[PDB]
Amino acid sequence: GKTVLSCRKGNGSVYQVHGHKRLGSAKLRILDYAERHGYMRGVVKSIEHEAGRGAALARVEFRHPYKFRRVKELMVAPEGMFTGQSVFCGQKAPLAIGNVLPLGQITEGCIVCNVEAKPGDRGTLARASGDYCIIISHNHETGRTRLKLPSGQKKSVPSTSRAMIGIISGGGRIEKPVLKAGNSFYRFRGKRNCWPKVRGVARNPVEHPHGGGNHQHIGHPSTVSRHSPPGQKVGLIAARRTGRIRGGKAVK
RNA sequence: UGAAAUGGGGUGCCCCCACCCGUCUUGAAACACGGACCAAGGAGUCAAACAGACGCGCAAGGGAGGAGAUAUGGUUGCCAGUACUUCUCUCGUACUGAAAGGGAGAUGCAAUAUGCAUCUGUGGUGUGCACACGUCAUUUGCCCAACACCGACCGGCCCUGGGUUGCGUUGGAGUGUGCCUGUUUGGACCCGAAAGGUGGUGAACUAUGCCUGAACAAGGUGAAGCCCGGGGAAACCCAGGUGGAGGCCUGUAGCGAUGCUGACGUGCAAAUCGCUCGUAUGAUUUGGGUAUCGGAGCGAAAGACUCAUCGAACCACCUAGUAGCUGGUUCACAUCGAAGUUUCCCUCAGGAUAGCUGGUGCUAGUAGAAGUAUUGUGCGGUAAAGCAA
RNA sequence: UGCAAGGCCGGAAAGAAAAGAAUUAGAGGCACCAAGUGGGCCUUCUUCGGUAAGCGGAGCAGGCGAUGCGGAAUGAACCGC
RNA sequence: AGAUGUGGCCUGGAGGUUAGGACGAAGCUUAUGGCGUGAGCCUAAGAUGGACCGGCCUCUAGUGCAGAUCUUGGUUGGCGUAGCAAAGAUCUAACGGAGAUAUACAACAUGCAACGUUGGAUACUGGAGCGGGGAAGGAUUUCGUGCCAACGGCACUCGU
RNA sequence: CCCAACUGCAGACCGUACUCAUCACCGCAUCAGGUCCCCAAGCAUAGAAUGCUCUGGUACAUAGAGAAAGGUACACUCAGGGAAGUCGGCAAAAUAGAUGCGUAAGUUCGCAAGAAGCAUUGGCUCUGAGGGCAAUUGCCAACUCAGAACUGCUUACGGCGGGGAAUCCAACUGUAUAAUUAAAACAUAGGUUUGUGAUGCAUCCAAGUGGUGUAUAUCGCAAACUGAUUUCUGCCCAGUGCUCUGAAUGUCAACGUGACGAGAUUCACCGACGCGCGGGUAAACGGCGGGAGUAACUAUGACUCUCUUAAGGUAGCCAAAUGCCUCGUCUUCCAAUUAGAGACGCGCAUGAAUGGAUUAAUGAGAUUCCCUCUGUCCCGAGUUACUAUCUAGCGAAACGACAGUCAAGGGAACGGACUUGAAGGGCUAAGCGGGGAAAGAAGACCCUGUUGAGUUUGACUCCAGUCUGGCUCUGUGCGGCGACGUUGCUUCACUUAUCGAAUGAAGAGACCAAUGGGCGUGCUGUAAACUGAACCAACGGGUCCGGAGUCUUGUUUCGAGACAUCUGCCAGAUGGGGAGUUUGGCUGGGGCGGCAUAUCUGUUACACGACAACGCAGGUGUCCUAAGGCGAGCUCAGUGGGAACAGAAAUCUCACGUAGAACACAAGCGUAAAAGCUUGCUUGAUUAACGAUUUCCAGUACGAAUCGAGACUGCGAAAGCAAGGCCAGCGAUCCUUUGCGAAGAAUAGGAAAUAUGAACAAAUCAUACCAGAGGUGUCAGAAUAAUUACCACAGGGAUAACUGGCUUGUGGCGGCCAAGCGUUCAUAGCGACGUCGCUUUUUGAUCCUUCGAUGUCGGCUCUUCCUAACCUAGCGCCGCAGAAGACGCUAAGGGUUGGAUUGUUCACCCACUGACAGGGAACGUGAGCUGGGUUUAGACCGUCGUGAGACAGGUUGGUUUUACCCUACUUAGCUGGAAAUUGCGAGAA
RNA sequence: GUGGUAAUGCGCACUUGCCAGGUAACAAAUCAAUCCUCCCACGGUGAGCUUUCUUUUCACCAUAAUCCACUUGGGCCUUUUUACGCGUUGUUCGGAGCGGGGGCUCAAGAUUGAAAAAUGCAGCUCGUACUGUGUGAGUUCUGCGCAUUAAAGCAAAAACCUGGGGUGU
């Protein structure tokens, strides 16, 4: 029959990021010679809001290390980062909220956000509003640093990786009930075409494996194998557990 | 020499007779289906393989095909024909075995794991045109064709002289062509599907996202914050204003489309109209641009929608798709004239097969005659009877 | 020289008497090619299932189907033909 | 149902043969008869036609129609019938125009209805307009003169 | 050369009309549909509502005459009653603006709410209050509100809510089947679960250093389920899924390795994910029991026992949209209640995110009562515009074999035509909807077809995707385990292949020097932060070199690294995500059942043979080295007399014993010194040269059988008997597979040696010829699961669902006889056991007509007919005193009701009445209506199914088209005519 | 280049060598409200009505671009110090400088002139000359944004502009 809707999102026709009103990507400053052997000092020129992001971004204005010009970097602001602040980024940079240190220089148990999982990555992780890592221990022989992240899993990043001290801006967002279909409207408007979402048992059998009839019901177990082909994987994909978690929630 | 007369023709009438055609059908005048009129079109063809009738040539031989050669090395043409030709090719004269291989006459003598001689001859027997010599239709002779019973001989396989086996022989009958009928495949007598396949065109209708513009009369209710006063030991609690919140209410435009099961229902209209009704600051309505489409698109999900087409669009093609199914199938007269049963089939609306039927016949016109008697001789367990067997 | 068989050669042959003691619009026999049909239905008599049926299923035959014509006012099949 | 026969009827053509025709060929029409059981043939008449064509033997095929919800063209009864009923509606005078005031012992009883423009009357739209300007789409519909064949489902003298 | 104010010259290209719509565009057209933007007057009024009007623009939509019925309406009214109408208050009426007072239960405290309800309102003449400005005083604008006196109402434009008591469902706004469904369905907020740290999860993609979520980073992204709040979410991990291990040693492919052999071939071992084993998981798919006894009357069973499961439905809830029985039972509502509400619960078949229970507000959702109101109704009547009607102009289509009056008969069983009768003069205008089994559309229902299509899965057959193994990519060094110096594997340290990332490839490494080659580590600045500036060298040294270290066995840098998510091929597992196709037949329609599909005995079967049914009564797929073969001896079932225990029944004995026994089995037939029984010896149950024949039949095959000829035999003295057990017990082509063709000889292929691999020859291998086996049971022999209510096509009345026809079991109605009832007395009135009929208002049975179509329940309306008579008329009879009534006769002229509940027909109750009789007319009556029911597409529940989906269960919503033709009928005109038009053919109530 | 304590005023140069920032650039509701429309007031010209009434009813009364020289609202400076005071219809503000005096600047106007009456309109005269020329209801231009609910925070770039630095030196 017809192709499932989870497969049609894979074309990217209507379902792409909207992202027009967005300001561009948010990254840490480039890793330079100064970044590695010293620190570069900028100043926070503003704090604003991407459409479709829950955090709060920052235009931080460094001076160009080489030519005569002034470069503006856009990074995800920590919690108490205020306009006019001076942000230090580099190896010599002191340990303070918003400064960016190489993650091997930071104490033992510090709170860290916006980590880069690869030394030059300009940060990929702990970037979502309110989220932070916890760096655990530095391994001085192998040159690694172990840290938990937000999902509870504990990873090991090469300690030349950089990091930004302090939790991410937004906080909450989630703790507040939406209350109406209406507030969910511009919710995703800045994000994607995710919504509203018809559940599978309602739609006809061509379109979905759940597409049954007399009584809305799946008719066959909803847990699906890992090796199931696209258009078949639907519902709970290789579930180890199912139903209420009564005690436990081991990190997934 | 104008007429008379018989026949044919026309129109009306009387007595009488008389259901509407084609069709499927056990059964049609049917309340079974096609059917207003006419003109002009309109359906067993062409090709190939095989066969049997019938016409023709030739005959243990027949016949080419392709090409060549000249009259023609000519002629606008009549000539793309006719005339001519061979070694070959091919169907035959011989068949048999899985194959290696083998491979056919008669008579006499005669029995020799290849016997020997002769060569004017049906291998023998029964039945059998014509002919011949007789006889009162028929005796004998030879018997042609042909039917039947046998033997011999060739090939296979055999038992131990015998069994059998071939689409074998036993003084050849083929071959070429015409024509007809019947199989067969091809569009295949003509018209007819729901479908299937390759390749293109569509988001002007409509689904959804995005860029950038536009729009929402008049009222009702009266959230936060703010201002004044009152109460209280405190904490806080009461009252009057202001303020103008909401996928809030009434109500235009707008966007919709509930009820009349109203009008209309060969319309104003291939979905419209009238009053009534839903919502009308929001998940709102809307213009232009732009993005995602065919086993795919998009979907607040109804199999919705994708240009009057959607449980798989549109266009051209494969495609005159296949149909055991429905419909049609155009001149006359004459001689004849059925079947719905048997057996087998994924067979039961169909076929093949025997039967019924026609055509061509062959054969010495009473033969091997009979849906019937009589005589003789066999067979039998129904009707009746019996339960005192 | 009995019996089996294939013959040969002779014999006779109301060509089948008499007894009711046959009859025939009795040319026998063989062959090739091929069509249509393979839904039937009705009736005397026999007949099975059914309460029965203008029901269902057979037997021996005759009809309609395919065929009118005369008759039973009318009727596929009855009666006569 | 089916099989076959015919010195058996018709049709377009090819090989032959024998004829016809401007003194009238094919075609066409007829209460035109004659012949054949029949398909059909043949003659007569045309106050039809205007140039081709018949018989007979043989060959040949895109060769014979009443029926397919057959194809195409035409016609036809139904029938001067259904109907031409949303958006209120027109009236009068003078002038235009072929469209009249149209007559073999007065005028009505014997030329009906309808058209345009101007003036007057009455009425509708009722500023979310049968008001004035643009996009999409159309592309000469705009404008003046002439004009009424067809076209504006009635009518025009008016008109896109 | 720049700047400033002037001046001089030049200023190109394309569109430009008109239209933007009741005529300029799209809708076949000048079509009541659709189509973006701008400007927008006066008065009433809250006003862009609605009504009228000045500017602008129009009089174009075919008209005229005009009182028929019937209609349509953006038109009204109605005495008395007031929902009795009806499926149902459908439609209409009703309510109504503003101001003041007033306002319930319930509640998420927001509402409910305009709840409900009461009252005021005009006109006129006055009065008060509400301000600005200028220097207490002076001058002025624009409106609103309140109060009073007088006076009036015919309650009087437009516009503008009826309201209340409850149940079911969804929380709400929203979306949603363009053109039959607007809902309870979808969405939603809220809840939960699953995958996932980027070399990732989901996933597009034929393919790439390809693409999407991702401009992202667990408060994220992806995939499901549930559907606000409140209150809760119980038990089951056996099954099917998903998943996790290792202590998972079984099994599975290729490669890899080794061995016999001349070799192909062959064999052994090694060999992953998966499967198996072992766990986990239900807000994964789902599931959640029976029987008996027992308490001081009875009834119930807290309580015992018992069977049994993975667990035995917990909290709740209910004849509810889920309850068959069922119109459940009780209470309430009403005169009356198949409806509604509240209860009850052994619940056919309620139940917990397949969500349970509640739930204020909300609803073009479903239902029931109440007030108000009414032409819905009793019961209809009058008026209006536009029609129809007549006219002027214009002018179609549907349809059409031919046609058109009936009754009865038969017929294809429901005629316009035929048969026998009764009507019938012709032509016409408006109506009407009985008929033309009227018109539309090659029945959509049903069956059939060796036709499909959409979906589903545990079908058959495969394909992508995902995973897994091997080789490869693929390098270097010291080693460790193995194997027979080499090689398999492998730890670790490396870096150039390769992979991941970043950067404008922007500063690597070294100098600090070895296992190399021929102090510190590139270093002005900061140490919580709280917005300044920095460029195009100053300068030093001899135009160069510094300032600004030099060097390069060389990567742009970082991470990983010979690994895998790298590359390619080979190999397996998974795999409805996707493809192709299939999903027997017969059949008193199909389905379910059966087997009448291949078959054997008796019967039907009609004294040869043959003969049907889903006719009757039974069998077959096997069993037997003896139950086969043979010779010999014997006699069986049973009965009777007699014999220790010992009897009805043990064993012995005698007599009788026509088979009454037996023979593997169904049945039939046959058999007595046997064909039975006992016993002996045995393998005729082998081979049998291609013999013939029967049975079925086409005179084909198969199966089975009969008669033979040959070989070697068995038993018997012998004659003879035996090639299985008589007769049912079974199998094509192709393919696979086994047996026979031993050795030896032949001077040559013969009488006698099996042939082939085709240029020869050997040994393998393969094949051939002959006879057997592996099997098709649908048995003359395909390889095969579902659903369609989203459905399609070709046809069928060869075949179901209506009517009609035959039949009448069944239903209904009646007769005959007379056992008995009736205290008595068969028959006043009844009438058993029997028995004979009728009717066609029941249901069957059949399948004759109709499938290129006869509109398929009930009510309303309307007419007519029948009589088996309820009332009405007349009468007989009685267990008839009267009154009331029973039974019967003639008789169908007349009459036969108002309601509650139900879609109902049927049924029940209320009420009236002289009575509330039973029926027919295509189960009369849909171009007459209505559309509640059934019978579609949407949707919910229960039960069933893994699933799509089903249900003759429940529920809500779901288009009702055409008449102008012919006849009929109802009225309305014209007009001939007696030889019924002519003949002159002549008849006087 | 140059004045003012200052907000900033006045008209030798070049700067797209380079850099930095602005304009372009987007935003509810309430209140006030521009052009303009309507209505009223004043009264000039013609017309309508007239039996009666109506100092009456109707129409018109206009000034384009361009360029010159008091009011309202905001930002700000100096001065005197304020901790209760200023202010809106309105949810405010101040020692990080309220209020008062005096000033600077910006936005929207008003006013007087250039254009410009030579035009337009109406009336009238014998195809001409003359005559005439509001504290009201609407109104989105504007005040007005770091500006709306917001798990919604509301495009970008040419082109221009000023400055930094420099050139002139």
Nucleotides of F under 7 A from a protein CB: 18-21, 146, 150-155
For residue A201, give Cα distances in angstroms to A12, A219, A223.
Answer: 24, 10, 15
Look up residue A235 and give its amino acid. G
Sequence-separated contacts (24+) of A152-159 with Cβ below 8 Å: A152/A251, A153/A251, A155/A117, A157/A103, A157/A115, A157/A116, A157/A117, A158/A118, A158/A119, A159/A102, A159/A103, A159/A104
Method: cryo-EM
Nucleotides of E under 7 A from a protein CB: 172-173, 185-190, 192-199, 201-205, 211-227, 237, 240-244, 280-286, 354-355, 454-458, 464-467, 500-504, 506-508, 522-532, 534-535, 557-560, 573-578, 940-951
Measure A80 CA to B190 C1' (Å).
93
End-to-end Cα distance, chain A? 35
Nucleotide with C1' nearest the A179 CA: E189
